[PDB]
Amino acid sequence: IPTVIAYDIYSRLLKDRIIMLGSAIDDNVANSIVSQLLFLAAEDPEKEISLYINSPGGSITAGMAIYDTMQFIKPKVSTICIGMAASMGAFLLAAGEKGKRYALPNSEVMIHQPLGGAQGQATEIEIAAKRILLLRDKLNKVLAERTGQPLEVIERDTDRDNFKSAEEALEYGLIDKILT
Amino acid sequence: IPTVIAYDIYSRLLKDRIIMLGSAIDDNVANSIVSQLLFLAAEDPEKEISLYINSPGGSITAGMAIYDTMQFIKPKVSTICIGMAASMGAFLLAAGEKGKRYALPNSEVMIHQPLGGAQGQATEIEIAAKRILLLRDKLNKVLAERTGQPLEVIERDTDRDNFKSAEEALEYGLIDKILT
Amino acid sequence: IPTVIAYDIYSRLLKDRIIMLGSAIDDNVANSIVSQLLFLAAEDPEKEISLYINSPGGSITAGMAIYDTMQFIKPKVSTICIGMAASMGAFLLAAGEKGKRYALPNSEVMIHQPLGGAQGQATEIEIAAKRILLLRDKLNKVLAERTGQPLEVIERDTDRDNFKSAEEALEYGLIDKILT
Amino acid sequence: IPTVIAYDIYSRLLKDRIIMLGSAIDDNVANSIVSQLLFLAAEDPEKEISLYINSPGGSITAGMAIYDTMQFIKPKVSTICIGMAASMGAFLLAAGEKGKRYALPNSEVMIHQPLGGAQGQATEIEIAAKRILLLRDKLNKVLAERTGQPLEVIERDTDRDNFKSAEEALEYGLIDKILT
Amino acid sequence: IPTVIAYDIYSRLLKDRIIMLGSAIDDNVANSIVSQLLFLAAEDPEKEISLYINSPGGSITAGMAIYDTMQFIKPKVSTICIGMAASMGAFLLAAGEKGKRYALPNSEVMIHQPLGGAQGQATEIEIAAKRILLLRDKLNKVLAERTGQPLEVIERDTDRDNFKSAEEALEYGLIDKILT
Amino acid sequence: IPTVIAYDIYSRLLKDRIIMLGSAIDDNVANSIVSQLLFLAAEDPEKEISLYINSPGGSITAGMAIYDTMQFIKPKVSTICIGMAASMGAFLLAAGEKGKRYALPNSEVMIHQPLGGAQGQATEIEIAAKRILLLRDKLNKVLAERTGQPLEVIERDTDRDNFKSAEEALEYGLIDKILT
Amino acid sequence: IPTVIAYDIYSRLLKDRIIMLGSAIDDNVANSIVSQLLFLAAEDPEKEISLYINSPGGSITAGMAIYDTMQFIKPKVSTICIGMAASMGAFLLAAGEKGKRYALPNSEVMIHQPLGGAQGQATEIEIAAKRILLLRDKLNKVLAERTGQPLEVIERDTDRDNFKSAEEALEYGLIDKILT
Amino acid sequence: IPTVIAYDIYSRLLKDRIIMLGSAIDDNVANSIVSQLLFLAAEDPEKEISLYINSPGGSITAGMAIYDTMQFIKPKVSTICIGMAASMGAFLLAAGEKGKRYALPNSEVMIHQPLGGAQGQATEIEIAAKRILLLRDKLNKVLAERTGQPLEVIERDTDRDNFKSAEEALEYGLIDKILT
Amino acid sequence: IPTVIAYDIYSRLLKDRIIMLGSAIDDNVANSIVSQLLFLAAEDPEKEISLYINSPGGSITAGMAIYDTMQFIKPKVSTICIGMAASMGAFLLAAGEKGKRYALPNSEVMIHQPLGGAQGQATEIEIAAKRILLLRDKLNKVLAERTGQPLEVIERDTDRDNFKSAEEALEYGLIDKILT
Amino acid sequence: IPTVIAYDIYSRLLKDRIIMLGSAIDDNVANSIVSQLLFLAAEDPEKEISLYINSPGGSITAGMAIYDTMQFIKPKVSTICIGMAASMGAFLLAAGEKGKRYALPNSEVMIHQPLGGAQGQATEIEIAAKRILLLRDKLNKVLAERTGQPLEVIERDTDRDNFKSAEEALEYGLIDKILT
Ligand SMILES: *P(=O)(OC(C)C)OC(C)C
Ligand SMILES: *P(=O)(OC(C)C)OC(C)C
């Protein structure tokens, strides 16, 4: 965590309206990011924001908190995938303002169905199946609207881990432009 | 594990057509009971059999192996509940030959819905939810037959752990005679 | 947790009267939140406070601490559920100023009954049982007042995990508005 | 464990109609003891049986299995406390044939209320509370019958651990003669 | 494991040409069952043999050793599913002599595709992937033959865990008759 | 470990001159097997021996002890691969008397280079490289003579895990006949 | 990590446009280095940047994020290998501006094929194998371009660990000059 | 360890005056081997004893125990190295009756100096050092006598691990003959 | 880690062009030393530098990073051995500018051959053996240059741990002046 | 550790030329202490330094680093024993400027021989033996010089742990005055 004189490198990037997501998305990362987002929007509701995404994914809910603040704030948020955007990573990526979603040449993107668990009485196992199947449905609809694909294609394509090159992700409609 | 003559005390009771179930029901136990059952039926096909039950319960499939074998052989099998017959144990107690299902005066019987778990993709959790709601239903229906209780009442009475004394187990139809 | 010029990102939002709740609720989180609350109330007894909630829930008594401090202070306290507000989290959502309780479109709220444990003599377990049932009722009334639901509906509704979409939470009366 | 000429010391004593309970009572001990009882009752429904008890106690349901069998088989069962009979041990000592319950001069007898545990939802903790309070009451009533004491005195005296010498056990009505 | 007068219960059943497979299939179980199968065939090459199956499944190679020994010997080997026959278990159930494959009414059968792992260099991963797809394809072609179904159906039906009732087992061609 | 009346199943197979190798080969298995081999040869130096091989492999030295006693004793030793013969497994398999080496239809055979480790001074690491490279060479020459293949083919073919069907192993020259 | 008057040593070097990669490359290191690279480019898009490399290597995606950022920015990025540059380390060393890739005289460079794992269903294993062979092929094609070697040479040279001296690095085309 | 009719396989070979050494040499193995040796010597002081050796070696003092018992007894003791005789194992090989020491063609013998440890005060470490050097010399002389090598060659030869083929062990004078 | 003024004591010595190495040499340490070195050379290129060495040794590649950087920069680096310079530490002590390499009167210097490990296929162990015999040789030759000792003598004197006092380190040519 | 106004308590005392050694001596403490010494000698080569010692002792080589520096820098170093100075602590106490070595009335001084360990081959244990016996002798000679005692008396008195009061330390020649 190098310093810039006083700043850590990320808060220095923050000053230029750049947010770095470099890790799995859990409730901590979500909180830091929603907070960076709220702060930037309060500073200049007019200027756009840049979110670099490199990430294996993580919590669906944490994921949606970030997704939802992206849309809810004034600034248009640009997303650049570097390395890998997988899972809730790809989702955040595809959540950039249309035309502003980027990847670098060697990026990967993966999309799949949600993972979870249930332990307990049959009744509690049912409650959890139900919830996760709705989660899977809520995400697919969001993805479909954002990629242009019909819901039933997203369903089939996310059945098992689905890995895409930057071209493939461009063709799929998850990103707009490959940067070079 | 004391010895008798050269037998071991459980084998000596087997000689009398007595099977003792004193542990949770898992695959070894089911394997051992099923073959003590098969053996006795082959020994004398018309001679009735005594199964003492004090068990916390266990696996449903190993439970059903013991159930089906009880029904499948010729000898009438009578079940005595000693101590506690819980869960898949109450199910076996209730599966003894009509009129031959006994409890001792301080026995407990406990009935509830199936317990399980699912991990993984929503697709996989749904597969597991589906199977366990089936197990729950297949079990409830056998139980209503055995007790003579209407199905909808078994579904209500097993929603959460339901502990019955020997008398309530009697008034419920899980046993025939309390013994003295 | 990045810096903003000297500040840390959450402290910069604290200046704007924004509290972030990003984690399970325990004595530590409660103590810090109540502290933030007392501080903001001493700063400008008149100006509104904003509480963003993404939480799995937590300790009932930590929760009530936060709940009572929100009521106790002069500032009206607005709550925004982002991601998930589960359990005591959902309870804190509902405790926001009537008309001022929000969710984002992809938010989940979940309500259920309290969880706990008892180890000991029959007496000590009884002490524990009576107490957890008292807390169940206390909460149920507080929830019924805040949602405008009749007490007996909250009671059948909190029996098992109850997961609601943002539209559904609005219907039930846990939030006043879904935002954009 | 040594061997007498081909037996082992305990099976040897089993020949002479002596049962040795030397450990804590759980499902295994219960099974082996109940099956020794039945074997001996099948061997001679007339001749008395001797149960030596030195035990810390144990599971309530394993203990009842043993209690109920002792009363069920025809042979009269004589109990002797060597060392200590506590909790379920004490209960089993008091359950020997009236006029047949003994102890050696240095024996201890301990009686107390049941121990248990409950985790989970309020509803689950309440079920466990009720079950364990029904157990306490059922044990208390049986103890009152067989000691001759009034139910309300058993309830007070078992509130916390009650340790008694053989004379005190004799004066309470837990045994009949102190042997020498 | 009780004893019968000097045999142990599984051995006395073996004397009747009954083999019990009651556990997961690993190199140990396979070594034991194969060797049981070779002894029975050396006893009476003419007389039929009965394999009872309650198993979670297990190693594909332990499995085939058993499978191939069933075929290699003269005795017609009859399979009975009690409890559950899953995975390599299901495969063996279906490998019994045609017309001799049985299940009890409450039995379950589960078929699925092979499970495994690869850790290493991309080269080693490739070797390991190529080998498991060969196993997959070798198992499917045998299931298609033993059941009657078309390969393309089997391949589609084994994609994820497929749980079947004894009636469904029967309708699919895994077993010939449901016993009572 | 079932019994035959008195024998465990393996010693009963031993009486018919059949040795079962069902596990990884370590110094214990090697010792039991060399010993079974010496015993059989002392009984009837004239009659042939049957060695069933199902095994992941193991210690090279343990492997050679078994190999070397096979050749050294009078009886011709037949080998039958069932399940999998891998590594030192394949080696033992290919060590059967020519014309007497068998597999069953679904068997696998794997051959690879030897695995090992070295930790210490450069000098000790060199000593171990040297030894293992000679081991690799000693085994390849043995394999080559036994399969008919030129040494330099064995070298290349064992570079990385090499898995063979029973046909492939027949074609390679590791076995003589596939049993049916 | 010493301090220099108020900077920490790595930061003061960063002020001179020097970045030190001194560890294994994971999402954290990559996030830090990429973000360092974006800050330097925003400082002076014209002026060159120096990346010192002593690294064991690491994640292929963390690696590419770094690689692709080096290319994406304006500053010509010069690499120096000190100590060792292995694996993704070697790949970055070779990714410096042509004529700007350096090593010190006692440096080592190691290239090899990618390492990974797959656990699961044959289907998941296949997906995982297909993806790693894609990475393999994507890395090789980039190494061939950056070095000058033919793809078929690179593929053959990376089969196992390939260790090279700085002179060998230089002769193979991984670096332009050995510094003194 | 299989049975032979009543015997266990090693005991059946004991009848034929054959001792099997299959494991690392410690106080337990030494005690059993010496015991076998004293027994065979009391049985027929005149007839030869056969000791098969497959061993990694072990405790120096356990080893000497075996060594001295072999010399001490009247029976000539023949040793056969099968697999590996390493360290004290190689030493025991060489201790067989001159002319009677054998190996099989694929056997390895290895010789080296003793291994040990010292923890403590300088004094205690010195005590330990002087002692392990004394054992080195003792062994070196015993080995030099038995191989017919001059003491100073054994000294340079045992400096690091020295691994010999069967041909090589014959040359060095550790064995008299390679068998077939 | 006491502070000075606001520095920390190691930074204050850095201000004097003093680097302290007090730990084993690993990648962090090498990273930190290399950059303290780079920093000082950039600060003043003609001003000589003091490196105190008390270290047990460490990684050879991190060791060589520090070596090469010492040679590569302009300032003359003088090495003072305090306490113990062992292994890669003795190598760095010996790499100080001729005439500028010092020890204190009670210092130790220890030289030995490289330590490492290899696991896996013979092919992989050989690759590792090869590299470490090279490292050993590259190191020996640098060491002979630095000491002025003939190569063949360095190879002899490092065969096993070789501990030299400050005077012997002097007579050997690893240092120039013992200090007082 | 608290802070004086901006220092921390120890750096504060460092200003006044006091060093506090309060823990066991290992490579870290040695580094920090030797560097405090050098800093202070650079600040005022004239003014005396105060080293307070309360330490259990520690590594011999870390201790010598400190010993040698104390004699090397120009400033005269005064040692004060508070609490206990043992092993290397005692050695450091005795190393203060003659006439400047103090202790408080209740201090303990302990002296003993070095502790070490050796594992491995005879050759390796002998190297460790020699090194540690050279160390013992070197420490002994320095202790003899600075106490005024004869070498042979130091050798006897350090054979096992020697605990001394301040008066006894004073009478031995380890210190100069007992302070008050
Ligand atoms: P991922 O983050 O899924 C699991 C890691 C929960 O995103 C999917 C739903 C596209
Ligand atoms: P129990 O044994 O349930 C769980 C322990 C699986 O039996 C029920 C079906 C009554």
Ligand SMILES: *P(=O)(OC(C)C)OC(C)C
């Ligand atoms: P949750 O936090 O309940 C358990 C997680 C303790 O809130 C409920 C009681 C509304």
Ligand SMILES: *P(=O)(OC(C)C)OC(C)C
């Ligand atoms: P103990 O057996 O109590 C616990 C050890 C369960 O209790 C008396 C009332 C019989």
Ligand SMILES: *P(=O)(OC(C)C)OC(C)C
């Ligand atoms: P199962 O036994 O699969 C895994 C448990 C290995 O049988 C399938 C492969 C047909």
Ligand SMILES: *P(=O)(OC(C)C)OC(C)C
């Ligand atoms: P495997 O047993 O190799 C390793 C498991 C040591 O046999 C090879 C040499 C064919």
Ligand SMILES: *P(=O)(OC(C)C)OC(C)C
């Ligand atoms: P390395 O970093 O490989 C493994 C450590 C993942 O670089 C290769 C893949 C080119």
Ligand SMILES: *P(=O)(OC(C)C)OC(C)C
């Ligand atoms: P090995 O058994 O040495 C060590 C393994 C203790 O025999 C040598 C001394 C010949």
Ligand SMILES: *P(=O)(OC(C)C)OC(C)C
């Ligand atoms: P050391 O640090 O050796 C091992 C600890 C790797 O340095 C030798 C090369 C003198």
Ligand SMILES: *P(=O)(OC(C)C)OC(C)C
């Ligand atoms: P202590 O420092 O001994 C051990 C703690 C290494 O020894 C005296 C001789 C200085």
